[PDB]
Amino acid sequence: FQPTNGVGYQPYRVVVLSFELLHAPATVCGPKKSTNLVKNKCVNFNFNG
Amino acid sequence: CVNLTTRTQLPPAYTNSFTRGVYYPDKVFRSSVLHS
């Protein structure tokens, strides 16, 4: 590569993020904030995804 | 490292595994089911 090459020969860096959705303990997470746990009531829940 | 050479050379022995070697294949709780 030289700076003035055509877009065909221009470098495109890549950082593929291979997200693993297998069933197991989950450590990497979204920035969402947690709320208090509510029991014995109809709720919309999100437990670690 | 030190190479230990004072060892008798006999052929391998064999035995019967019976029903050992079964493990939990996954990390999900299930009960009163048969899973293939």
B26 interface with A at CB cutoff 8 Å: yes
**Which DSSP symbol is given to B27?**
S
Nearest chain A Cα distance for residue B12, angstroms: 40
Tokens linked to A20: 């693993």
Residues in chain B: 36
Name the experiment that determined this structure: cryo-EM
Instruction: Produce one character per residue of A7-41: b if its CB has 16 or more CB atoms within 10 Å, e if not.
Output: eeeeeeeeeeeeeeeeeeeeeeeeeeeeeeeeeee
Q: Are residues A25 and B27, on separate chains, in Cβ contact within 8 Å?
A: yes
Rounded Cα distance between A25 and A45, Å, is 18
**Which DSSP symbol is given to A7?**
T
Using a CB-CB cut-off of 8 Å, the residues of chain B touching A48 are: none
